[PDB]
């Protein structure tokens, strides 16, 4: 069918464009993770966007950025499902992409993957990361 609004938001937040996802858009997606229907659509689209290679690395990098944000500020179900699909996060630590100009863009995906896995496996730390992230999200909504 047509994409749901939640799916459209995830695709925009992970678009193959030279700009990272805005905090405002990620915050909207985070709220939608509490919606039982939207949650599954959101997660599925993120896993799909992470499934890419080489020159399409921005899809992957931005999808990881969004996943990190949702792990920290969305429903606790996000982190739960990421832990259950840990392998799919771990594989990204080996992603490679050096462009035609010889510049290593893939090292960025590898670095973010490494720190994303650490965030998911360090259980005591996740509690503190969520508290700080949620406070940051609250301030975002209370500022222009």
Curated annotation (Swiss-Prot):
Belongs to the epsin family. The NPF repeat domain is involved in EPS15 binding. The DPW repeat domain is involved in AP2A2 and clathrin binding. GO terms for molecular function: clathrin adaptor activity; clathrin binding; molecular sequestering activity; phospholipid binding; transmembrane transporter binding. Monomer. Binds ITSN1. Binds clathrin, ZBTB16/ZNF145, AP2A1 and AP2A2. Binds ubiquitinated proteins. Interacts with RALBP1 in a complex also containing NUMB and TFAP2A during interphase and mitosis. Interacts with AP2B1. Interacts with UBQLN2. Interacts with REPS2; the interaction is direct. Interacts with EPS15; the interaction is direct. Interacts with ENTREP1. A 1,2-diacyl-sn-glycero-3-phospho-(1D-myo-inositol-4,5-bisphosphate) binds at residues 11, 16, 49, 59. It is found in: Cytoplasm; Cell membrane; Nucleus; Membrane, Clathrin-coated pit. It comes from Rattus norvegicus. GO terms for biological process: clathrin coat assembly; embryonic organ development; endocytosis; female pregnancy; in utero embryonic development; membrane fission; negative regulation of sprouting angiogenesis; Notch signaling pathway. Residues 1-130 form the ENTH domain. It comes from the Eukaryota. GO terms for cellular component: clathrin vesicle coat; clathrin-coated pit; cytosol; endosome; nucleus; plasma membrane; postsynapse; postsynaptic membrane. This is Epsin-1. Ubiquitinated. Binds to membranes enriched in phosphatidylinositol 4,5-bisphosphate (PtdIns(4,5)P2). Modifies membrane curvature and facilitates the formation of clathrin-coated invaginations. Regulates receptor-mediated endocytosis. Ubiquitously expressed. Detected in liver, spleen and testis, and weakly in lung and thymus (at protein level). The chain holds residues 15 to 158 of 575 of the full protein. Keywords: Cell membrane, Coated pit, Cytoplasm, Endocytosis, Lipid-binding, Membrane, Methylation, Nucleus, Phosphoprotein, Repeat, Ubl conjugation.
């Amino acid at each position: 069918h047509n994409y749901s609004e939640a799916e459209i938001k995830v695709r925009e937040a992970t678009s193959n464009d030279p700009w990272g996802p805005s905090s405002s858009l990620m915050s909207e997606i985070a709220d939608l993770t509490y919606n039982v229907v939207a949650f599954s659509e959101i997660m599925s689209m993120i896993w799909k966007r992470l499934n890419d290679h080489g020159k399409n690395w921005r899809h992957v990098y931005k999808a990881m950025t969004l996943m990190e944000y949702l792990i920290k500020t969305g429903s606790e179900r996000v982190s739960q499902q990421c832990k259950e699909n840990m392998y799919a996060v771990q594989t990204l630590k080996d992603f490679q992409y050096v462009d035609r100009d010889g510049k290593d863009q893939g090292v960025n995906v590898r670095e973010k993957a490494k720190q994303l896995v650490a965030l998911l496996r360090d259980e005591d730390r996740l509690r503190e990361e969520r508290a700080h992230a949620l406070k940051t999200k609250e301030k975002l909504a209370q500022t222009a």
